[PDB]
Design a binder for this molecule. Sequence first.
Ligand SMILES: O=C(CCc1ncccn1)Nc1cc(-c2ccc3c(c2)CCCC3)n[nH]1
Lengths: 554, 400
Amino acid sequence: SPISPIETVPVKLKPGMDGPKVKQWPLTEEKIKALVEICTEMEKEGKISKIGPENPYNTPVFAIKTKWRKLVDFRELNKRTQDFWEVQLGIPHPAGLKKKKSVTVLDVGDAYFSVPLDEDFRKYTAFTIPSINNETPGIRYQYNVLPQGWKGSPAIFQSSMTKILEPFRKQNPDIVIYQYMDDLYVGSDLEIGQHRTKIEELRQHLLRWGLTTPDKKHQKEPPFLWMGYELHPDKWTVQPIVLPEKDSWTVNDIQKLVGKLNWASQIYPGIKVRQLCKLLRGTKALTEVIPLTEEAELELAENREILKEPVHGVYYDPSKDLIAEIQKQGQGQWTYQIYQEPFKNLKTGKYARMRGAHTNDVKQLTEAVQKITTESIVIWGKTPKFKLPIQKETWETWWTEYWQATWIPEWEFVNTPPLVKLWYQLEKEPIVGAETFYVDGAANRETKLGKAGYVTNRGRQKVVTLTDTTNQKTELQAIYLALQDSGLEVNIVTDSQYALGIIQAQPDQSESELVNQIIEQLIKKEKVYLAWVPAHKGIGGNEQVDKLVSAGIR
Amino acid sequence: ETVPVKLKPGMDGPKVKQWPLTEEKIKALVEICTEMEKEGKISKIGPENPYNTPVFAIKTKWRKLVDFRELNKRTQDFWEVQLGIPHPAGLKKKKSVTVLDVGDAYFSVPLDEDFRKYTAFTIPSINNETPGIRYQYNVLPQGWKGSPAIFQSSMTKILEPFRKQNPDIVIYQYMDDLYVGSDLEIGQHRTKIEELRQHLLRWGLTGYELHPDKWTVQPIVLPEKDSWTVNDIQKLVGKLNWASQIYPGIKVRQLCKLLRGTKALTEVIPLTEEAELELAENREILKEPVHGVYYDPSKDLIAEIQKQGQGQWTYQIYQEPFKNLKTGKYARHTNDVKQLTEAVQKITTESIVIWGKTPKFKLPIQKETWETWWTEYWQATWIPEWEFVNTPPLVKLWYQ
Ligand SMILES: O=C(CCc1ncccn1)Nc1cc(-c2ccc3c(c2)CCCC3)n[nH]1
């Protein structure tokens, strides 16, 4: 196997550090013999070189078994080697691959060993094959090439492969080369003949640099099986997904199931995982069987049906625009598809999120648009045109009145129910001939006890007691009280910026049952006006409900 | 000969992740960097450099913007203590201030060989097809606060004749820009700028017109009403109560007196007009500056922005919450993200003019939305620091 004529990468140790000086532990006679055979072969191949006792460094070596293999423990050297540039930002996604007439995969044989190591660093890769029962000095060696398990090997290899392909890429601009680990994905729109001829031209360019690739007979042909994907010449999909039929499901079985479903969600639309995820709460043991809920059984059944018949995705055409469609799937669940030619998907996906405690479908939809946009820039270098299940008027109303800067790139409405809407809207000015509730909530920090109540301009009053509450919970209870005993038109005056803040963002869903109870009241109402006043400043109305809730509390 | 750049102890270079870029932005950066490398300005680097600084492309002509916010924080002692550029207090007093890009100056001056690694940046690729293109600077980079600091002596020699001939003209350098202020008639000022461009042209160096003397406060506006409801007085007390934490001497006792018992919101309650004394006195305080607030050069500046709707935005600048040094507004096919970047840039510019430093922003937007779209409209060669906040419901109306 060749050792490439490339200029080596200058490697250093971390500032203020010396190389490893880790003692070699006495090994068995069989282990020593096996290491001697391995090392003399590696030395004959130029991979390692004998050293003198002058070199004070050492890293432990081990052997494991029909055929014995050498294991170098570089834990110490790794902890002392400098940091390197992170190889990649991410992995290539199949949907991002341009469609090519002819494609072939070239793996690099004994990749790391085919790249030389910086002469000034070789010194620190020192290891010893111990003598029988550690009597005589051991056999000492050091690496000449990039060693397996050492920190700089992935980075220096990739950088060497980049420098090597650089001329070839220039003298062949109509050929795409994808670099991932010890692999090369080579594609062109050439008819097979001149393509397999261009591959051999690349193989030969690689050999001039000490890099071996397999010949026509051994090199990989489509369908490619890579990173859980099936890559065909004109389509792609995820590797066969099978959902096990089980009497009892353990935490581990549900974990394995969620992962498979999430992996399948990249090309199969509709996949849901909410009910199955909810089961995994509670910190139970891996072997602990989790009984399914009606909803989880219902979710699993729908997923089985989606996965019943196989689905594939297409490749990218850089001339055509990208289109992204989104659908509300249910409570906090969103689904999307990205295509160029109507309903021939490049990929799919899902969005589910709790970006806070109280939210609404309009906020959820902007979050999904943002996530999809980011993903498009990463995979294709351009943003998609959105088709949203929200009217332009609903969007215009929301963004115009919201406190936050909110933006959605060019989009179009699509009548795909359920449609995204606001379920209620607060009044802009006080209501004439509607009752004015002055609400308040207070809670004793020492007892956790509290009172929630209201005083009106129509004589009405009420005070309710709560036992394991907070100031926040009593302030929300006070609003709920006023919404319960008020009728279809009401004005509410609070001293709580917290409750004002929540209600003003028009939430339709919350992690709080209290907020959800408030929401169902706000929807049923015809007109609601909420207003704020400073607390304990002697404001009329607020002063009267203050003394009331403070009785036996604060 | 290069000036040795010594990093702050205990902390080392930036390791900031590169943001995904669009095809057009990547292509533009490749052309720019291929040209800079041919000129010796930048050099390709290996994997043995673990450092990284984000890079972007802004605007017909595409230009390279390197985000050195991290490297700058890690070199604070060099450009601020060791080689500080004094900020003139007279600059904000000028009738006209013209901003000139002088960043092209830096590519003539080489950078210390042992500091070059800290300037590492990556040109990303689409769908991670290929490993990103890595480079480092050989010359003083645009966006590095260290560059105007090192270049200070050269810049002084360049400007010496112009300054000597025009003593009433203030020239301030902040990052890649020159701030030129005068009290001259606009035609004479524009003529003196042109003259300075010529002096700069003789050293290889090559618009934006501000009027600082015309910079006034946004007083907390109190309504003028013929008829006042319970709700109007409630809204008024809240605004004043809040203003009493900032402004020394704000009264509310008399206005509060009107609000007695559980009265209806729409109920018109004619004013005592004895309380009007407070209204008037408060109005007089609010139009004048805040007594007792002073710029502290050791503390950082904070700028908060609120969306007011109809293309209007309000902002406040302070060091200690509620101790406003300056307040103001910003008004406008323009979207929220476009308007917010415009407001951030206008506030930053005013901040450099008044204090010689950029503020740390509290932006009422989603981190992700902002990060995806801010470069689409960004035109400045500097980037201020920023945080993402959830604007309190009442701070908007208190500044309305
Ligand atoms: O083809 C096979 C499996 C063959 C097989 N196994 C078993 C049975 C029958 N056939 N392996 C394979 C595929 C790839 C590959 C595919 C795509 C891409 C890259 C690499 C690099 C990034 C870009 C896209 N590498 N090695």
